[PDB]
Amino acid sequence: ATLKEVEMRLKSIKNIEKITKTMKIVASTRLSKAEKAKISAKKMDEAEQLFYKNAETKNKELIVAITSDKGLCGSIHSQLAKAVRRHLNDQPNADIVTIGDKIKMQLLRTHPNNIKLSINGIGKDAPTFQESALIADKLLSVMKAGTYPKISIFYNDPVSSLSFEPSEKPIFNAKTIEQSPSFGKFEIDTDANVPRDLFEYTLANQMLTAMAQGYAAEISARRNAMDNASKNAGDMINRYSILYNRTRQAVITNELVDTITGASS
Amino acid sequence: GEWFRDNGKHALIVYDDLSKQAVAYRQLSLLLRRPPGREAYPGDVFYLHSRLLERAAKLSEKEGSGSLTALPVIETQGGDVSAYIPTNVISITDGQIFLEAELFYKGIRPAINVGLSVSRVGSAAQVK
Amino acid sequence: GEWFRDNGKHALIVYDDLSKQAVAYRQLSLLLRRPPGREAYPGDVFYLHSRLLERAAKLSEKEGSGSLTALPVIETQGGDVSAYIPTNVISITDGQIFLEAELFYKGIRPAINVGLSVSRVGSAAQVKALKQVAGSLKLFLAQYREVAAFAQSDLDASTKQTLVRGERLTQLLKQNQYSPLATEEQVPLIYAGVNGHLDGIELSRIGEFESSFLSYLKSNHNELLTEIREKGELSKELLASLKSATESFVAT
Amino acid sequence: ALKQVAGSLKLFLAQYREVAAFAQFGSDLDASTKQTLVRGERLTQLLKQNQYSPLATEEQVPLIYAGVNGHLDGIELSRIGEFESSFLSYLKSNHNELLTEIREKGELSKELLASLKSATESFVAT
Amino acid sequence: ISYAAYLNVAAQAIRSTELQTASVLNRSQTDAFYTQYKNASEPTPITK
Amino acid sequence: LTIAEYFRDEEGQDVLLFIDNIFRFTQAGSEVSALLGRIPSAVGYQPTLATDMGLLQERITTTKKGSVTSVQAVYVPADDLTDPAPATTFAHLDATTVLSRGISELGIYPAVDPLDSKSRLLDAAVVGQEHYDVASKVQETLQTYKSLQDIIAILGMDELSEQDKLTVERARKIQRFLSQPFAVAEVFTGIPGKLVRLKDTVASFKAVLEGKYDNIPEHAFYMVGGIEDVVAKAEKLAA
Amino acid sequence: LTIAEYFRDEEGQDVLLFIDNIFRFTQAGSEVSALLGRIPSAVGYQPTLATDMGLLQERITTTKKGSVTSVQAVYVPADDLTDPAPATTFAHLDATTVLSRGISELGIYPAVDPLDSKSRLLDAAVVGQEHYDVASKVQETLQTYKSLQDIIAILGMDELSEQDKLTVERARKIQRFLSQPFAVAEVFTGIPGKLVRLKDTVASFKAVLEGKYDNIPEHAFYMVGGIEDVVAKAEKLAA
Amino acid sequence: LDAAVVGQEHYDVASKVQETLQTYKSLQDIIAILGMDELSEQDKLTVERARKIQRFLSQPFAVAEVFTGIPGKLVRLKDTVASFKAVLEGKYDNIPEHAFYMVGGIEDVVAKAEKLAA
Amino acid sequence: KLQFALPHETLYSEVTQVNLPAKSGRIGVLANHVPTVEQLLPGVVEVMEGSNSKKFFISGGFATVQPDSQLCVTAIEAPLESFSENIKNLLAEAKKNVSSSREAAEAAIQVEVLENLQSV
């Protein structure tokens, strides 16, 4: 309406636009780092996971949901929480551990009693084995994880840089590893609990594998998110600049009229 | 154009463009010392156009059934259809064909913007 | 000032400031009931300032080669260079040194906005020695501004490097009031900055760096300073002498 | 009396709108930032008022006391209107000596404050 | 101490001046915090 | 003014002149100007705004005869600091306290805009190098914060770098440490007025900038006096 | 202008007229009108802005004898394209030539922006169907190149389709081919100057667009005239 | 628009409708730049409902038949009041927006919804 | 065929022999090895391509020889002396004095890794 108003609104967006675009290149940069974390964890995913295929391992339930603490990344947390919810009907008595606040917020609006542990301050650097392992150490201790017949990891699977895929995968406990169909295809030394170790190692590992893919999926969503934000932010800037110029011109004309009216007498 | 309307035939009139006419008009008004108003156009700039486009008409049976059809051209600045003169002529005509600069540069020509274009009376006159 | 120019000498004239003059001229015009225009300024308010500012000139040989140089000052309102009088003077002169409150409180004093400043005369007005080191500086800062936004974690090798130089070179251009430097004091400092001899030195110390570097140059390298001062150029030999002197001091 | 109960209320609401500005960021809050966000949202609602229905100070003082001193923080927001005329009705019958004391002394002695403190807590559980 | 944790100690001793890059250090540092949840409220936040 | 001039020249000694509000002088000038037959100048003010002001302000000066310390309240129309009245007033002053609405709606009083308020006397040659430096860094810390207020909005407090987070955290404190209970403002605060000595003011802020008080919560700096008042309020809150 | 007019009217020449700067023509009129007491029109301009512009521009034209062709330097106030001054002027401009620091920084002389510079006459019915079609794809290629600059900066050169990795290689050449050594600049350059005939230019680019010169290295397109100069220079940078 | 003249129920529906329309408006800018995904699930819902109400406020006029192509509808006050009240009560959220566009009262919404299924 | 992988970098993912610090002691897994699962202690791993061999130091993890003769070595950290004496000593004395300072659980396990790496 007034030039002073239109001056600040135009200049406000002029920043949001430069902001979102700076966060769109910060994303693209962080994406080279992302595939060095995805691929390097999808290969450790063939190797680690292959034992279980050959041994033919199959199986109160423990759900671990994985996203992050940070917004501005499309529908990453929205539809993952939607996959957990969809699954949660078929067994409402599940115990939920949330990795990321945004996902905790989502499931706290819908299943607050099911949430027993929340892992925080995650989305920053890429996921490491230490976070992976220390979360795992908490699950085993505080959640008593080893006692659930069913453990599930929900995370986003990056099919490409353009879209992702909310996914699920199971973690088998010691009992289930032992009793698997083809567990006696392997000359395992029957001594110092190997199923115990293989479980607690796989609990950390497949969590990391999940985080590492969810990460990658988020960075590629945040990029695409910022890319349109910048596109709209920039398109708004054009319409406001146009409005500015009208209002500038109008301020000159109207002051000039007062001055002309004043001299007229 | 009216001679044809008045005598029983049909004439088409194209005003290319009214924007420039209204500019010419404001010049005189200012030089005559008529109070400037919105965008420094005189108060009667609407009347300038309205009296003109009112002469475009379709006559009854009793008057030979002659027709004057007007196609005024208006030039917007940076696609702003909210300006004083554009809205004035929009408010006199029976619709407008709005041509979007965005489509025109893209190659889509005629560059008709569908949402922003309307004929107000045409349907009942368009070939079935 | 024209007395000097006319007798083969050189004057510098500072009109502090032409905003306030414009205002005075307007007062008379409105009182003499002359037709007012934009901002109630008379239709000859451009001609007031062009008449004036065209009187600065460098004369030819025939005419004694005298000179008058003009530094008019203009006060803008909240940065609006589109205001009537700012527009007049900006289009009359040969360039702007543009100052900003932002840069001022940030510490950058003089608060020169490099982006929005220019001399249209440019290099033809600059001591060759300085031009040789300052050629690049124009750039290392230009790109720094195009990338300055990134100074907020995951930055690749190339873009971080440019951030290191920019920071340092900005700090180098910080200057105490009433403390102008000699050209032969300036080019060493800019040589050090431009070529990367400051990249190591931490940012809060570039102050004491300039300080000591000059006194160390006066104690031990007075000859190079003298050659810069007197010949104004940099010979290939001098660049080498400068490259050595700098690394020498940096190491301590 | 009203000055007493409206201790920092104007500034408190400024702290509230500063807090609710950071909420838009899709942010989860802590013990300090959720606690204040909750109360301000209720204090706002308490200040809503129908037209042609001015209140007496002896009616106002209690509600504000109930708002600023935490006694509304755990009540559903759609029910703050009904809390008004119910808490008023309750004080008019049972604690009519409390209101008369306010309409005539215009101040709050430590005794009135303790008497009010209890009278509110009482009504919270109906 | 879990087997994953056991392996971390060894893995991060296999870390703890050069060859000690950025992402190497930043694998020995975790910003994470845990918070237990019940009835939801919580059992006050703590570092991992 | 004429009264205070006599004291300056004929009692030949220090006089204080308090004027509230000098803007009304220029404004009143405006109100008659149109009737006095004058074509109105920009924004509708008189053609003689500045010279009118000159003849007034130039009289309010210290001379070789005696001393005038004037304090003038200057109204700023619509909050616009470029309106030709406050605009033309500035050049006339030796020191300018700019009070801001943004500041007052955060509950900081006095609402002095710390970046926009200026003084001819903030100079190493007058206040000493230390006093100067503390003021300078204080101003830098606050401006850093001001610049970073848009990254706060879109990307949250968390997205800041190492040294920046700390600076921003030090700013928020400094910001609140500049608030002060005035004695005349007591009915607006309920807090007793506090008057702080300059040497303490420097000493205190110098210390805060060195981070010697970073483990102290924000509310301990707000509406207090010297540094000792912070230490003391941080134990009242710990209790 | 009158001087240029006589060369058309008496010698029947195709004259050039240079106006630098046309905006100062409009401001001057603005100033004179104001001085003569005329009530200023919108945004402070003269009421006679458009006829003033006409009375100049309409004299610049083709007749049967010859033509005056005017190249006029245009300045845009506030960078507001819709300001009366440009808005009026642009109503007479048949075409534009945009010289851009963004082009001269890449070492292209002249520094014409191949996409910002436009023409009304770039139309089949004015230039022939061939000429248009070359120019058109020349323009469409450089656009696709421009929107591929961002992915080359971050991803890599290898992340492109079969046809698109060929057309970036093609544009990069087209681009360097649009530079030209000027005859007058020889005193400063030492390079003898080329005046490239229109028929040459159409054929030269037509040949590259079909992909006849992908074998040619990129440096053979820099500062050359006709396609016969590309054939010639490429042989020097080898043998 | 006074609770005494139109009755409390009509007033209350009108108020809650305006509230909802206002929330959406307060968000236009966030919705425009950052889109629907950045909103709290609370707002996400209020917006989605506001978008329906907005369409439901449209009406084929009898005189505007030549531009809608649909025969005009006149809707009665009580039928209007009951219809919107129900949309507020979250009883029609599982229904597509376009069903609310250019119809009469609630019974036509269901009609358009069931027709647009096939 | 070998699948060697770290979480951060994957190293192998066609080999004639591998040597591992398994369950109890060093093993050598030949071209046709009986399927087995063994924990890897933190130790030195060697890969063969003829007599070509690059040693790696390792955080520990798991090895599995598959039914189809594939090996799957998976550990957190992996070159030997070209990568990782005094560097390790300023951490080894910090452990012995940390046992007497619960926290003493992890600090004592660090010492069994130290004097093992010290033997390389």
Swiss-Prot record, chain A:
**Impact upon substituting S163I:** In strain: D273-10B/A1
- One matching Pfam family, short form? ATP-synt
**Function description:** Mitochondrial membrane ATP synthase (F(1)F(0) ATP synthase or Complex V) produces ATP from ADP in the presence of a proton gradient across the membrane which is generated by electron transport complexes of the respiratory chain. F-type ATPases consist of two structural domains, F(1) - containing the extramembraneous catalytic core, and F(0) - containing the membrane proton channel, linked together by a central stalk and a peripheral stalk. During catalysis, ATP synthesis in the catalytic domain of F(1) is coupled via a rotary mechanism of the central stalk subunits to proton translocation.
What does UniProt give as GO cellular component?
mitochondrial inner membrane; mitochondrion; proton-transporting ATP synthase complex
Q: How does it sit in the membrane?
A: Peripheral membrane protein
Gene name tied to this protein: ATP3
Its keywords, alphabetically, are:
ATP synthesis, CF(1), Hydrogen ion transport, Ion transport, Membrane, Mitochondrion, Mitochondrion inner membrane, Transit peptide, Transport
* Gene Ontology biological process terms in this record: proton motive force-driven ATP synthesis
| Name the record gives this protein | ATP synthase subunit gamma, mitochondrial
Q: What is its main location?
A: mitochondrion
Against SUPFAM superfamilies, the record matches this protein to: ATP synthase (F1-ATPase), gamma subunit
The entry's localization annotation reads:
Mitochondrion; Mitochondrion inner membrane
Q: Which domain of life is it from?
A: Eukaryota
Curated annotation (Swiss-Prot), chain D:
Annotated TM spans? none
Q: Where in or outside the cell is it found?
A: Mitochondrion inner membrane
The similarity annotation says: Belongs to the ATPase alpha/beta chains family.
Q: How does this chain assemble?
A: F-type ATPases have 2 components, CF(1) - the catalytic core - and CF(0) - the membrane proton channel. CF(1) has five subunits: alpha(3), beta(3), gamma(1), delta(1), epsilon(1). CF(0) has three main subunits: a, b and c.
What else does UniProt say about it?
Answer: Present with 41500 molecules/cell in log phase SD medium.
The free-text function statement in the UniProt record for this protein reads: Mitochondrial membrane ATP synthase (F(1)F(0) ATP synthase or Complex V) produces ATP from ADP in the presence of a proton gradient across the membrane which is generated by electron transport complexes of the respiratory chain. F-type ATPases consist of two structural domains, F(1) - containing the extramembraneous catalytic core, and F(0) - containing the membrane proton channel, linked together by a central stalk and a peripheral stalk. During catalysis, ATP synthesis in the catalytic domain of F(1) is coupled via a rotary mechanism of the central stalk subunits to proton translocation.
Would you tell me the protein name for this molecule? ATP synthase subunit alpha, mitochondrial
**Gene name, Swiss-Prot/TrEMBL:** ATP1
Parent sequence residues shown: 419 to 544 of 545
Swiss-Prot record, chain E:
Q: What keywords were assigned to this record? A: ATP synthesis, CF(1), Hydrogen ion transport, Ion transport, Membrane, Mitochondrion, Mitochondrion inner membrane, Phosphoprotein, Transport
Query: What GO cellular component entries does it have?
Result: mitochondrial inner membrane; mitochondrion; proton-transporting ATP synthase complex
The record's InterPro entries line, in alphabetical order, gives: ATP_synth_F1_esu_mt, ATP_synth_F1_esu_sf_mt
Cellular compartments annotated = Mitochondrion; Mitochondrion inner membrane
Q: List the molecular function annotations (GO) for this entry.
A: proton-transporting ATP synthase activity, rotational mechanism
Gene Ontology BP term (one): proton motive force-driven mitochondrial ATP synthesis
Cell membrane as UniProt keyword: no
Entries under Pfam families matching the protein: ATP-synt_Eps
Domain of life here? Eukaryota
Concerning Gene3D superfamilies, the annotation shows: ATP synthase, F1 complex, epsilon subunit superfamily, mitochondrial
Mitochondrion keyword on record:
yes
Which PANTHER family does this one have? ATP SYNTHASE EPSILON CHAIN, MITOCHONDRIAL, ATP SYNTHASE SUBUNIT EPSILON, MITOCHONDRIAL
State its role: Mitochondrial membrane ATP synthase (F(1)F(0) ATP synthase or Complex V) produces ATP from ADP in the presence of a proton gradient across the membrane which is generated by electron transport complexes of the respiratory chain. F-type ATPases consist of two structural domains, F(1) - containing the extramembraneous catalytic core, and F(0) - containing the membrane proton channel, linked together by a central stalk and a peripheral stalk. During catalysis, ATP synthesis in the catalytic domain of F(1) is coupled via a rotary mechanism of the central stalk subunits to proton translocation.
UniProt name for this protein: ATP synthase subunit epsilon, mitochondrial
Swiss-Prot record, chain H:
Which biological processes are named by the entry's GO terms? proton motive force-driven ATP synthesis; proton motive force-driven mitochondrial ATP synthesis
One Gene Ontology MF term: ATP hydrolysis activity
* Any one annotated GO CC term: mitochondrial intermembrane space
Subcellular locations according to the entry: Mitochondrion; Mitochondrion inner membrane
- Primary residence: mitochondrion
What keywords were assigned to this record? ATP synthesis, ATP-binding, CF(1), Hydrogen ion transport, Ion transport, Membrane, Mitochondrion, Mitochondrion inner membrane, Nucleotide-binding, Phosphoprotein, Transit peptide, Translocase, Transport
Q: What does this protein do?
A: Mitochondrial membrane ATP synthase (F(1)F(0) ATP synthase or Complex V) produces ATP from ADP in the presence of a proton gradient across the membrane which is generated by electron transport complexes of the respiratory chain. F-type ATPases consist of two structural domains, F(1) - containing the extramembraneous catalytic core, and F(0) - containing the membrane proton channel, linked together by a central stalk and a peripheral stalk. During catalysis, ATP synthesis in the catalytic domain of F(1) is coupled via a rotary mechanism of the central stalk subunits to proton translocation.
| Similarity section | Belongs to the ATPase alpha/beta chains family.
Give the note: Present with 164000 molecules/cell in log phase SD medium.
Name used for this protein in its record: ATP synthase subunit beta, mitochondrial
Q: Which organism is it from?
A: Saccharomyces cerevisiae (strain ATCC 204508 / S288c) (Baker's yeast)
Q: Which gene encodes it?
A: ATP2
The residues of the intact protein that this chain contains are 391 to 508 of 511
